[PDB]
Design a protein around this ligand. Structure first.
Ligand SMILES: [Mg+2]
Ligand SMILES: [Mg+2]
Ligand SMILES: [Mg+2]
Ligand SMILES: [Mg+2]
Ligand SMILES: [Mg+2]
Ligand SMILES: [Mg+2]
Ligand SMILES: [Mg+2]
Ligand SMILES: [Mg+2]
Ligand SMILES: [Mg+2]
Ligand SMILES: [Mg+2]
Ligand SMILES: [Mg+2]
Ligand SMILES: [Mg+2]
Ligand SMILES: [Mg+2]
Ligand SMILES: [Mg+2]
Ligand SMILES: [Mg+2]
Ligand SMILES: [Mg+2]
Ligand SMILES: [Mg+2]
Ligand SMILES: [Mg+2]
Ligand SMILES: [Mg+2]
Ligand SMILES: [Mg+2]
Ligand SMILES: [Mg+2]
Ligand SMILES: [Mg+2]
Lengths: 101, 326, 116, 305
RNA sequence: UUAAGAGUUAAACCUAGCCAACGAUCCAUAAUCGAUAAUGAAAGUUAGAACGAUCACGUUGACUCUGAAAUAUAGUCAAUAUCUAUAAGAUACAGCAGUGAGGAAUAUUGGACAAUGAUCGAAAGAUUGAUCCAGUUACUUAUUAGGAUGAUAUAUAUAUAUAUAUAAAUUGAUUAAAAAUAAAAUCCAUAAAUAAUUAAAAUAAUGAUAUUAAUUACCAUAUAUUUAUAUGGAUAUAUAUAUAUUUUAAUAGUCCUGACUAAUAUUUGUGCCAGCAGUCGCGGUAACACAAAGAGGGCGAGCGUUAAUCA
RNA sequence: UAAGAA
């Protein structure tokens, strides 16, 4: 699949995604912040090109279900800035992107 | 600090902050850190093991964990390649005086840099500093006693016995060459010119040559054979008894046997693999001085923290030390 | 010293490394108890001077931080300085020679100079 | 999965076969010997590529992956060598094509596994003297020297100070012959900084990244509004990023005390304010704690803060 | 009555109220807190030893005097327990040392008032187990606790890929099975010692610490700005003076290697025994787990373990 | 600036 990534390093916002018995709480992180997440999620992030990520798993911590549900979290529970801007007809500006020109 | 123990084990293959020959081979045969087929703990452990073998191995684990900083520092260019932020995992060690000396190439190792500091051979902007843990701030000038730097960077001074045996061998080879030249100068000239053709101009001898006569072989003179048993223990004797075109009136490597290095000064062997000019220091080698410009930073496509390991290894080590190995 | 209110030195720092607060204190409270006010600090060890700088002729510096306006207030309302504090305040110009003693009573090589 | 893995070379080498009962050898030792080649009677490895320093401002960094771990060369002709079945060193049967067309970026890469570590450029003595003269004699500001020569300002100031120290040392005949030979052999090992080239001149528009900006913040605004760096700076409550470069390119009452003959020290009283001056009461004691504060005296002595 | 309000305490009269399931009353337990310590991402949680703040007590209880302020470490009476002086006596170490006991467990019957304070005195000064120093104790935290080089030993024979042979070569093993650049040897240091000085803590003078730190490796001076060459006192020598000018190192334990959990180079003994174990569990002849050898992985003047706190 | 494991 294709995974949306903000700046090709993290997720756009935060994700609170339930996949069967697994409650994933993912949070985008700053540059230089590592992959501070469950080990299954760490491997998926290593393969997907996510570099900066924080998060926590609640209820079920089954490895297979974590693995499968994190991918629906990445694909379904994310909206890029372009999608939001076009849907709302508004301009979404990244303040840090503009501070450095 | 830790007692240096098996820092150059070939079987372990850890790369040290050192210009050592065994360290050079360990670096050469390494390849990369193999992280495949490993659990996350095993990956982090391997990363920590290798990277702490290089960065600050002489620090105890608890002291390093205390001085470890989660903060990583970078510069944004206002005028593209990805900034390797996590190569700054060990940047905090680079402001230590003992690491600054090694990066300035004023010592062969961080260990030697510690000893140079502890023995009073180092100064920080005037004042003698005897504490390797001393941390430099931007703009600080430090200096080393030039003899210490010359010894770190130079070749080992031979002892009398070893140099005398080497010079015996020198005499034997010189006499063999003289005999060969005298008997058959035709083939010797032919071989000399052919070798001059084969070699590259990079050698100074080729440039000098660019810059038959039977008289040539008449100039070559045999050299008397020396037996060291009678010549042992008398350096003034052997000094005058050795007279060769290259080395004149001194035993091998001991032109002035009162300096702490191979006295006709030549660089130490295997120096070029580790010859790296840091981005955060300005180095003046005539005076054996340096200036600490800034703490090392990461910019797009580059990190000024010199390391033999790739970004993934430092990522895993940083993950290890964030949580104290939890 | 006399009186309930006294300007004196309270010891801080480690063993063999004394530093002091110049404090206005109740006469009965312990030396290192929290005082009425902390008027300043006093480091009794002079600042080291290099041997070449001794050839130049610098004098080692003993560092004193002090709130002058508040110290004059406390002297005004009747607080009584100790002997060491009396010496410190006399050389700061806060107190004059009238606070000197017979033992403490000479040629001036430098003159008390105020800078901004 | 993880086991102990003896760090054998990643490239082929001839391993031990049957060994005489008293050899007592390891494959790692043989691999090192083959990497090093024969040792002279002088204790030298003339046959190893890396034994001797370069002389043409092209660093001779290791390339165990390009050259398949074959580090041997003829010292005079510099032609590659290989260990034949019979224990001699001769020409390779086939020539390597990975050792001729080496990317220019790879030649400045000290370590084969870290693409982000590159050696810096040495400045020629002529350029250093030029910068010293410009700063000290012609009084040109460090900003315009930095722009002219493409060097970061702290590096320019460091060059000025180092050249001053060099001038003193030369006036005192303290730079010995050994020091000059060491300096010139080190100088011929590294690439030379070239002011004119665009890719060899340092970037001059770098500012530290502060914690405040690092967090991503997004604003939803009308589709046509302009939003520039100044508006972004206002949103984050910071100076705009250009004043940071601009500012990086660039009273208390005291009373000195009366000294009299025989007095070994002087008193200087610095004015302070009650409620801000003093050692606080019941402050945290860290002396038995792992983060105890260590400092250094003006004489360089380690002291406890 | 008190300086002063109030069932605060005492007296009189009234009214019938007051508290309580958002927990009264009663019982038990506990000194309390911080810009202090621990921990955590944080909210918080824990501690209340150290630093500081507040309270209470000075063997137990009540009362009284003085005092601005005391149920005072005072006085009276009583209780408890000891000493003698045997009395309308003294003492009560929760002041500093120290002892016995209890306990898993917590130190000197030390030095000085030199510094900072406190008391007395007009001062000279006196006193200070406050305090400052030292002692004991890895209880905690630091810093040091050596760098570079180093796989052989014999022979024979302006160049340089030196080449021949003879010895040997520890444990394991027969090659990806190592121990091991580890040893030894080599070069160069510094610590300690040895001598010279020697500040600073404090000055008007006084230094317990103190065989001080620091500096110099013969001593000064005379110019340069730490490195120099000179002038003069040393210095034995040989024969005033060419010369050199102390000596000099290297000392790590403890746990673990089936998984969780880093530890692949394999072997030996035992045989559901002996034992191991935080959890799963291992041991019945082929034990990666027991007890060991080899090798290996941690942490390191500590390591483990138990008890606990936080997560 | 929130990671889990048997
Ligand atoms: Mg009085
Ligand atoms: Mg394992
Ligand atoms: Mg009333
Ligand atoms: Mg009544
Ligand atoms: Mg109740
Ligand atoms: Mg109680
Ligand atoms: Mg409590
Ligand atoms: Mg307390
Ligand atoms: Mg206590
Ligand atoms: Mg009481
Ligand atoms: Mg008692
Ligand atoms: Mg009582
Ligand atoms: Mg007692
Ligand atoms: Mg007992
Ligand atoms: Mg006193
Ligand atoms: Mg006493
Ligand atoms: Mg054997
Ligand atoms: Mg068995
Ligand atoms: Mg086990
Ligand atoms: Mg066992
Ligand atoms: Mg063993
Ligand atoms: Mg320690």
């Amino acid at each position: 699949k294709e995974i949306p990534r903000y700046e090709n390093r993290t997720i756009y916002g935060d994700i609170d995604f339930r996949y069967h018995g697994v409650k994933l709480h993912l949070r985008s992180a700053k540059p230089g912040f590592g992959l501070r997440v469950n080990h299954v999620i760490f491997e998926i992030c290593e393969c997907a090109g996510i570099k900066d990520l924080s998060g926590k798993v609640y209820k079920s911590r089954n490895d297979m279900n974590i693995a499968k549900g994190t991918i629906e979290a990445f694909t379904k529970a994310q909206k890029t800035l372009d999608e939001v801007a076009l849907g709302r007809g508004k301009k979404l500006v990244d303040v840090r992107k503009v501070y450095y020109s | 600090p830790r007692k240096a123990n098996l820092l150059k084990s070939l079987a372990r293959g850890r790369v040290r902050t050192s210009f050592n020959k065994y360290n050079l081979f360990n670096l050469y045969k390494k390849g990369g850190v193999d992280l495949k087929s490993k659990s996350l703990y095993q990956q982090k452990w391997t990363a920590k093991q290798e990277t702490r073998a290089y960065h600050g191995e002489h620090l105890t684990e608890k002291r390093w964990q205390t001085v470890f900083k989660p903060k990583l520092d970078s510069v944004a260019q206002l005028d593209i390649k990805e900034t390797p932020f996590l190569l700054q995992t060990f940047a905090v060690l680079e402001k230590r005086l003992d690491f600054a000396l090694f990066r300035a190439m004023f010592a062969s190792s961080v260990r030697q840099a510690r000893q140079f500091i502890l023995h009073g051979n180092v100064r920080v902007n005037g004042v003698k500093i005897k504490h390797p843990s001393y941390t430099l701030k931007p703009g600080d000038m430090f200096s080393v006693k030039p003899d210490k730097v010359l010894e770190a960077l130079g070749a080992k001074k031979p002892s009398f016995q070893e140099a005398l045996k080497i010079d015996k061998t020198q005499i034997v080879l010189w006499n063999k060459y003289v005999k060969e030249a005298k008997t058959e100068p035709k083939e010797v000239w032919e071989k000399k010119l052919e070798n001059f053709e084969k070699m590259s101009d990079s050698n100074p001898k080729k440039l000098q040559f660019q810059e038959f006569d039977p008289k040539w072989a008449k100039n070559l003179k045999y050299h008397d054979p020396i037996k060291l048993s009678e010549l042992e223990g008398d350096e003034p004797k052997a000094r005058k008894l050795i007279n060769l075109p290259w080395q004149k009136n001194y035993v091998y490597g001991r032109q002035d046997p009162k300096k702490p290095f191979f006295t006709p000064w030549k660089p130490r062997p295997f120096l070029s693999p580790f010859a790296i000019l840091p981005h955060h220091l300005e180095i003046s080698f005539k005076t054996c001085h340096a200036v600490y410009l800034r703490d090392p930073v990461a910019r797009p496509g580059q990190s000024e923290v010199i390391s033999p390991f790739d970004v993934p290894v430092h990522e895993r080590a940083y993950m290890y030390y964030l949580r104290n190995g939890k | 010293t006399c009186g309930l209110v006294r300007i004196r030195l309270a010891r801080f720092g480690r063993k063999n490394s004394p530093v002091y607060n110049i404090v206005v204190a109740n006469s009965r409270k312990a030396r290192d108890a929290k005082p009425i006010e902390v008027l300043g600090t006093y480091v009794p060890v002079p600042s080291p001077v290099t041997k070449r700088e001794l050839k130049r002729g610098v004098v080692p510096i003993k560092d004193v931080k002090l709130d002058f306006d508040r110290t004059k207030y406390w002297i005004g309302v009747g607080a009584q300085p100790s002997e060491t504090v009396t010496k410190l305040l006399r050389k700061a110009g806060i107190l004059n020679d009238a606070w000197a003693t017979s033992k403490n009573s000479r040629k001036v090589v430098f003159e008390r100079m105020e800078t901004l | 999965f993880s086991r102990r893995r003896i760090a054998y070379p990643f490239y082929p080498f001839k391993k031990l076969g049957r060994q005489h009962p008293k050899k007592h050898d390891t494959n790692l030792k043989t691999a090192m010997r083959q990497f090093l080649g024969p040792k002279n009677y002088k204790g030298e490895y003339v046959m190893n590529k890396y034994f001797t320093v370069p002389t043409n401002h092209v660093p001779n960094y290791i390339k165990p992956d390009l050259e398949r771990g074959q580090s041997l060369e003829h010292p005079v002709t510099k032609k590659p060598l290989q260990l034949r079945y019979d224990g001699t060193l001769g020409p390779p049967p086939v020539e390597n094509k990975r050792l001729q067309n080496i990317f220019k970026d790879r030649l400045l890469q000290p370590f084969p596994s870290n693409p982000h570590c590159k050696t810096n450029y040495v400045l020629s003595p002529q350029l250093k003297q030029s910068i010293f003269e410009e700063i000290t004699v012609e009084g040109l500001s460090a900003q315009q020297v930095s722009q002219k020569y493409g060097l970061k300002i702290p590096r320019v100031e460091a060059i000025v100070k180092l050249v001053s120290v060099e001038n003193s040392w030369n006036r005192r005949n303290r730079v010995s012959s050994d020091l000059k030979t060491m300096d010139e052999t080190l100088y011929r090992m590294f690439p030379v900084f070239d002011s004119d080239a665009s890719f060899k001149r340092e970037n001059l528009s770098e500012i530290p990244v502060p914690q405040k900006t690092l967090a991503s913040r997004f604003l939803t605004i009308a589709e046509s509004e302009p939003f520039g760096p100044v508006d972004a700076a206002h949103v984050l409550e910071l100076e705009p990023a250009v004043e940071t470069l601009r500012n990086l390119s660039t009273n208390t009452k005291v009373i000195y005390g009366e000294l009299v003959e025989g007095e070994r020290s002087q008193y200087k009283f610095t004015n302070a304010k009650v409620g801000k001056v003093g050692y606080r009461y019941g402050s945290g004691n860290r002396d038995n704690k792992k983060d105890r504060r260590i400092g250094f005296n003006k004489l360089g002595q380690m002291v406890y803060i």
